[model samples]
Target: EVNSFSGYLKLTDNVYIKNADIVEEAKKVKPTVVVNAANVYLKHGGGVAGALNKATNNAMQVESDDYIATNGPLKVGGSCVLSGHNLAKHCLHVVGPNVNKGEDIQLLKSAYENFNQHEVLLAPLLSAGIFGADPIHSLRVCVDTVRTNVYLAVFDKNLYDKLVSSFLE
Candidate 1:
């Protein structure tokens, strides 16, 4: 299933609520640019970053880490654009908000704002993993905050339903 709400897009794909897989979700849309909510190390350890790594045959992680090694640590709400090989034409690896550290909402807004140039983007609900924010809340901020055309991919059923019902309005 697919829908656009409040300027952002969503797709249930074939799996729907069965799997919250970012790679499969992203592949369905085939977005020109995919956004990875990365860490300071840019390692693609888990969550959306891990999915992006798998989508690119692990090239995304290697290249991203190299960029960080050369340029220094990635700051929260900061972004580093990289060329994509497998999943997307380009990728923007962003150091997103840390929910436990507080200021989650403002940080998320800043992260999305950094990507103002891109038109069609696929971004997972930020801070839903180890960062520890509720997926729906994070997704709401992501959907409502961005200026460019963006899509919110919610992998888990609970989160998906929450977004679906909220978007239905």
Candidate 2:
């Protein structure tokens, strides 16, 4: 559960938070936890999802699907936990809402709420503009939502700057 004073910090130094290959960084640095923006079906179709899939040797997809099959579809604002030897110690796969079909703009917040427990987390800048969300606002939401150290990974310098600036302010 998320609290008003979730004590996570937005760390940027020596950490992996740039547009470089997240998989390589993950394999190299090996944070205690990793996160992926996934769909309800748990397919690694693209973006972070694909990178996680590639790194984990597609084990994430298989296990995630099995978990969903037994539990049910992962709600748009919900998450499923998974882990494997190829991946990190833990993986939080959260689903972003379909902005085109639904108007529950809090989906990203909902997705991030589940990341509160981990000590160190690696995640992408989620749903910023790509899914009808304001980029700056999303960065703010991340700071408020996570209760652990979060290193936001992005490929674009502009996005990176925006996230870094969000912390400075």
Candidate 3:
């Protein structure tokens, strides 16, 4: 079952934390934008990127490829916007820093800050998967940087429970 919590990061904005499928949640919420925890190359090969690509009938990957062809690889903590198909209205692909780096925290914070202009956003725990960031640290950075209505979608139950306890409870 999907577990959830709701709280405020900003006084005027609500943050919904969920341990559920992000794509499914995006479909349900229909937020103005969805944030992808993407690599610098923006290749939708696996993980959340793969899931989003599959859900969009491979359109996401195609657009990502086109974006890369035109703009080259994104810098760490940089972002690019793309059209979302059968998901949200738009997608913001942000590249977080690998945890091994000394500046990871600042870079990851920049990743979220780069796209905070949207009204409503659905996001995952960036860099907490293959990139190897600490879940709570990433959560803290994300919550600190994003001031809009955010739906934080997490896949792992342990991390989600911890996040709910740390922030929501």
Candidate 4:
């Protein structure tokens, strides 16, 4: 169930899709710059954020709190960069739109765009979890928006297969 597939989209040259653990991959990848599908509040309480918090010994959460204290709550589509403590060199926390609040494709695009300046990036399927975004659509949007060596880490086997098949067609 680990790293079952890896490939680039036919439509894009630099975007890579992989079925793997993002945290583990980030550890192996140098100049690690990972993205967090974060909430507007920048709370690393659950999901990928929670995993990162535990992995970094709560340093990520501390930095996230400090960022919010200084900069105010992050807006949907806005991003904040935190210096990594252990697992990565940098972590880009981007707030994606919650579909229940009205799905904004552009906002999601902006989320990805805000962090696309990096040469190598690791990201999850933004807005596709508790935010209720359609995973397939979100993946399409991400592939269309990013132009760097983006590594999409999909943990679900079915979703990973779907993403791979979608690119094949």
Candidate 5:
């Protein structure tokens, strides 16, 4: 559970937080105990979801189901596949954008490339009247290599560390 003024944060209890501000409380609270030995994770602006998937799940159906422009959720839709690993007992899937078909989205878990910029690449293409581009085309233009402004939006140090530790085994 992510908390602010954390005297005691327990399992099944979720709170939103920033990673930098919690180091001191982390040592004191020691969530593993509070969570009753379940893994207690850090979550924040990026929400800790993407990393969760990479850490825990060993199976990825590397299908060609790359995100197409037509599939872009609405600007206000609460749908976005963001960060955090799932190796621990609990997993958090972060969403950086609003999702339209929240219930219908066929999102894979928090599978992430260490340096990711999915959302940053989204806006310009979306504004350019592009939605749901052909999957092959999205990759052909090398969308994966393109970089975007992701500093305060998603992917923090803790989440990155968790991801590296989880996948590199």
Candidate 6:
């Protein structure tokens, strides 16, 4: 069984979801942070190329820096906590409990530009002892690396290179 899924989290409010474009969708809910999700929610125009094209190996690319919406995998939105899987920049980056498409891979790339969350990355380590996939262990390492990078970004790019390599090894 998937260990990650076993750790079910009751999502609270405060979560900002993009309905159309992240920037635009965010207008509805003044979120402290923004996370571009692509499971149940679909992002259109502006810069995003719509939801992840999971049908194929490659995920849909974001031609523009903007998006039509950035809602969550949730069936609906409410006072949800600031949690998300693949977002550009936000206070937190919720490790994917689920990665329907390739966006899971593309989200990291987006982080390069949206550095706001970069500092905080706020990348949430979702998995913890998650089966063989080991998203659990990976999330922990990623959070550590991200936290280091956030503090280190000020110094320069390679500040967290060591952390990154350590995780790899």
Q: Give TM-scores for every candidate, taking all chains together and pairing residue i with residue i.
A: 0.79, 0.80, 0.86, 0.88, 0.20, 0.24
RMSD after CA superposition, every candidate:
5.3, 5.9, 4.2, 3.8, 16.9, 15.8
Best by lDDT: 3
Error of 2 at 32 (Å): 1.6
TM-score of 2: 0.80
Query: What is the lDDT of every predicted structure here?
Result: 0.68, 0.68, 0.78, 0.77, 0.23, 0.27
The per-candidate count of clashes, in order, stands at 1, 2, 0, 0, 26, 25
Supply the global lDDT for candidate 1. Answer: 0.68
Clashes of 4: 0
Off by over 4 Å in 3: 1-13, 100-103
lDDT of 3 by residue, 1-169 (tens): 1222243233225566777889888776666788888888988889898898899999898888988998899999899889967787889998888776554566878887866788778888888877788888887787777877777788878878887777754
Give the deviation of candidate 6 from the true structure as CA RMSD: 15.8
Candidate rank order under TM-score: 4, 3, 2, 1, 6, 5
On lDDT, the stronger of 3 and 6 is 3
Tens-place lDDT per residue, model 5, 130-159, is: 122222222212233324221111124554
- Strongest candidate by TM-score: 4
Query: Which parts of model 6 are misplaced by more than 4 Å?
Result: 1-31, 37-117, 121-133, 148-169
Residues 93-167, candidate 2: write the lDDT tens digits: 877665656647777788778777676777766665346667677677776777666766676777777666766
Tens digits of lDDT, candidate 6, 1-169: 1101111121212111111333332333333344332222333222222322221122333321122246434321111223232333122322333333222433433332333333232122222112122332433334433322321111112423433444456
lDDT tens string, model 4, 26-137?
A: 6666346788888888888888889878888888888888888999998889888888676667888889998977867668888878767777777888888788888888
Summing lDDT over every window of 10 consecutive residues in candidate 3, give the lowest-scoring window.
Answer: 1-10
Better of 4 and 5 by lDDT: 4
